[PDB]
């Protein structure tokens, strides 16, 4: 089974980094 796109992301980016990124995006949405 080939690695999915998520599998690849998980190799290079911590979940804490991903949370920070998601927050920065949620922010641009709500502004506004």
């Amino acid at each position: 089974p080939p690695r999915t796109h998520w599998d690849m992301l998980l190799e290079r980016r911590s979940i804490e980094e991903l949370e920070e990124l998601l927050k920065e995006r949620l922010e641009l949405i709500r502004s506004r």
Partner: protein
């Protein structure tokens, strides 16, 4: 542009993560409040849009590389097809934090897919 490149890649990662978060939340019977779910859903869809856009902005690069390999047994459209598989492989593996352009990064993956496709048909 190199700048718009990074913005697209961030949107992709955020979208992937938003997707995973909702998937794993489902696996534990928990649901997000409707307001969160709506934003997560938007981020997920925005990520897929960013992926399509990054792909689209680099299809011409696939074509320029494929033209190097015409007239050697493989039809032009077949070169482009294989080149495109190289391109999405680069998209999924690309790391925007390193500092180099995506197009620079994709070049090797695109040539590789084309090269291996030509060797394996023969």
């Amino acid at each position: 542009n190199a700048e718009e490149e990074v913005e697209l890649a961030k949107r992709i990662e955020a979208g992937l993560y938003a997707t995973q978060l909702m998937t794993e939340l489902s696996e534990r019977g928990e649901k997000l409040p409707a307001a969160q779910r709506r934003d997560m859903m938007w981020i997920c869809r925005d990520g897929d849009r960013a992926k399509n856009h990054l792909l689209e902005a680099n299809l011409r690069l696939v074509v320029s590389l494929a033209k190097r390999y015409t007239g050697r047994g493989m039809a032009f459209l077949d070169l482009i097809q294989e080149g495109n598989l190289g391109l999405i492989r680069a998209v999924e593996k690309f790391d925007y934090t390193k500092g180099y352009k995506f197009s620079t990064y994709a070049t090797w993956w695109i040539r590789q897919a084309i090269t291996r496709a030509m060797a394996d048909q023969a």
